């Protein structure tokens, strides 16, 4: 009676969630563009209609692959550079005394030591100004890296500035993008498109502040895997950027001293001018209005009458306890306590934060690999945007109306999850079987 | 220029989506980072070749819409033609018979084998 027969369809529009290996579409630097595919000048976007797809921000395989790829790129770029094993000698250090300011006291020390030279059977006495965080007492000091592992001095030519890296899928795979505004990263997105490649994702590294991130088009947005549970972090994406400018006013000098045949070590010379602490300014009014938006959006979830307390970082290592970022060839560790110090209940001045500059950089929370950064000649200024935040709720006795959110971080996946929250990877299955009145022969 | 409307008919009904199968078929083929790209390409090639072999084993080689001679058992789906080709989309249909796929493939395979054997027997005479 049915007289229905199987029919095979090829090229069917059906897909399933899957994980694969994406590659570059970038258009000398640490983020190697040569080992990255070039993109087309006319990217194609196909906006699917009457389809709703279940997105999940916290189960995306794109962010883990991006983290692994960034680590691999960092290691590959650091491999062809001088290894500073001879520079683990004992240092005779004294405090600086010329043009020293009160803030920059108990700080960069004039150290002198013997080091090898081009000729093996000879030594040279050299001097350099080493920041306090780099050196540690055994009137003699040793670098902090000495008992952990040797450093690979980052080569001067390669620049650390982020460069966008457009991710793409291989053949037979598609990148779905959720255009639905006010999308919280999880659940059914009704507005779906297919993109040949992702947008320009700048591989910026930072903690407590997502610098140069993607801005929300609607308002401040709060995202969390489980907002009820305080263990999981909370990502806040702003709708407008807060302009922030950091600077190291000291006019440092770089001197190259030969530690071996070909290998040359770059050292700090004379601090031309006055020794002043590196400082970073952020607008007070812009910060106030942005914080107002954040507290409103957080009250949307945590109640319309609860008190919102923002306090400085709890504690731990320097990298996670302070806003640590990199720009202009220098790594700053600015202390964010004046920003996240306020309580909320139902003109031209700006907040100035102090910044400490390290050289021995143990990034990626890895042990056994350090990244002594050569000094940068001249004064460094760095203007950037703040468009994100990573906040953690202090659980425990917060069952009452009290709510205390503090800056967090440590893991760099949250930085990548704020820009890949809309991209998902699917695999197509062209084969399909249906009923039809056909009959072969 | 080849991408130019990949998928697109995902939200369309099965009957309408069956009219744009070509656009979804052209895009199914096209130190350690060279290995990454190479492995991606080889995986895509292997998947495409497996799909083509599966199509060929059923006798549908070189056809996008090829319908066989095996019957549609009512146990797989009681939905009728008026409610499947004009009221349901391809994703829902795939999710509905996701667990009744292997037996259909086996039936198609054995039917094609029997058809080829019958053709050989008839042509031998």
């Amino acid at each position, epitope marked *: 009676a049915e007289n229905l027969w199987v029919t095979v369809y090829y090229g069917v529009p059906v897909w399933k969630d899957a994980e694969t290996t994406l590659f570059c579409a970038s258009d000398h630097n640490v983020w190697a563009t040569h080992a990255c595919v070039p993109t087309d000048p006319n990217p194609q976007e196909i906006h*699917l209609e009457n389809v709703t797809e279940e997105f999940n921000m916290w189960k995306n395989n794109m962010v883990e692959q991006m983290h692994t790829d960034i680590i691999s790129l960092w290691d590959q770029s650091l491999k062809p550079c001088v290894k500073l094993t001879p520079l683990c000698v004992t240092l005779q250090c004294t405090n600086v005394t010329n043009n020293i300011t009160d803030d920059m006291r108990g700080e960069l020390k004039n150290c002198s030591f013997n080091m090898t030279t081009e000729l093996r059977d000879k030594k040279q006495k050299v001097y350099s100004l080493f920041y306090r965080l780099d050196v540690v007492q055994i009137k003699e000091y040793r670098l902090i890296n000495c008992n952990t592992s040797a450093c690979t001095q980052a080569c001067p030519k390669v620049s650390f500035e982020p460069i966008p890296i457009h991710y793409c899928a291989p053949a037979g795979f598609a990148i779905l993008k959720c255009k639905d505004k006010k999308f919280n990263g999880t659940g059914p997105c009704p507005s779906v498109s297919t993109v040949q490649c992702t947008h320009g994702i700048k591989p910026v590294v930072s903690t407590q502040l997502l610098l140069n991130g993607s801005l929300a088009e609607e308002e401040v947005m709060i995202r969390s895997e489980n907002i009820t549970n305080n263990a999981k972090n909370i990502l806040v994406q702003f709708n407008t950027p807060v302009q922030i400018n950091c600077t190291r006013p000291n006019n440092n000098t770089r001197k190259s001293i030969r530690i071996g045949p070909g290998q040359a070590f770059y050292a700090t010379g004379d601090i031309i001018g006055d020794i002043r602490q590196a400082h970073c300014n952020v607008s007070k009014a812009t910060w106030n209005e942005t914080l107002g938006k954040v507290v409103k959006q957080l009250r949307k979830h945590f109640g319309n009458n609860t008190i919102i307390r923002f306090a400085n970082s709890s504690g731990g290592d320097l990298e996670v306890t302070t806003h640590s970022f990199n720009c202009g060839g220098e790594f700053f560790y600015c202390n964010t306590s004046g920003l996240f110090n306020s309580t909320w209940i139902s003109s031209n001045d700006s907040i100035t934060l102090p910044c400490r500059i390290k050289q021995i950089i143990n990034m990626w929370q890895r042990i056994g690999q350090c990244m002594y950064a050569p000094p940068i000649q001249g004064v460094i200024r760095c203007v950037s945007n703040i468009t994100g935040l990573i906040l953690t709720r202090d659980g425990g006795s917060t069952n009452s109306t009290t709510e205390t959110f503090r800056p967090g971080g440590g893991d760099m996946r949250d930085n990548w999850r704020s820009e890949l929250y809309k991209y998902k990877v699917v695999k197509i299955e062209p084969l399909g079987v249906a009923p039809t009145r056909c009959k072969r022969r | 220029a080849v991408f*130019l*409307g990949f998928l697109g*008919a995902a*939200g*369309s*009904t099965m009957g309408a989506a069956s009219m744009t199968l070509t*656009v979804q078929a052209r895009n199914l083929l096209s130190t350690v980072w060279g290995i990454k790209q190479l492995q991606a390409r080889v995986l895509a090639v292997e998947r495409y070749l497996r799909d083509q072999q599966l199509l060929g084993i059923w006798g549908c080689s070189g056809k996008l819409i090829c319908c066989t001679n095996v019957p549609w058992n009512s146990s797989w789906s009681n939905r009728n033609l008026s409610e499947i080709w004009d009221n349901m989309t391809w994703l829902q249909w795939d999710k509905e018979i996701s667990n009744y796929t292997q037996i259909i493939y086996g039936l198609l395979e054995e039917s094609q084998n029997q058809q080829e054997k019958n053709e050989q027997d008839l042509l031998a005479l």
Partner: antibody
Amino acid sequence: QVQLQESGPGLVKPSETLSLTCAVYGSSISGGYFYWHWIRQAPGKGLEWIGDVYFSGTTGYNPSLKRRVRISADTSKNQFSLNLRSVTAADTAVYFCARDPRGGGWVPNRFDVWGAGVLVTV
Amino acid sequence: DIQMTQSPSSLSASVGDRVTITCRASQDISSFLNWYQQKPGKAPKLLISSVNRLESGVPSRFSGSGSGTEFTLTVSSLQPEDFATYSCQQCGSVPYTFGQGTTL
């Protein structure tokens, strides 16, 4: 956010080809889900269908203007164009470009989103 | 080429009052009718589709009824922004012809 914008000469000598390009920001012409129509409305009159174009080039024009009109859709830059030849005084009208969710058998001709509407006097 | 006639060709009413507009087709179009709305200046906006099915995003006051060769659009309570030119459509056969347009 999906919309359409029309461009072209707003005034033309009434004997030559009249070109009007409608470009859509939002959905894509390449996707086989929407037909792209070219509804017209003269002053003091009702709407009047002219023609439609699909992603595969299977276009269909009004029987009244099956000879004087040609609709060409280019998906590389995601737009379409109406070329109305031998324009006369009867073509003084507002030329809307509309989107039809006929692609997919969910609904029949259901013009939902309309362009801004350019008045091409002649 | 089905021809559509809207009755009345033009009417005037007062706010908060019922109004009804009839549409007649020369042939039988089954239930393939969509009621549109064109505020002056801007482009037409769809109000109703398939005679009775109300499109998402309109006030519930609008309603449609009828079948065969006769259809009707009813507004239960007139509102200040409901002073646009309603139209008809033939959404069941090429070519699609609209109505003359009744101005409120």
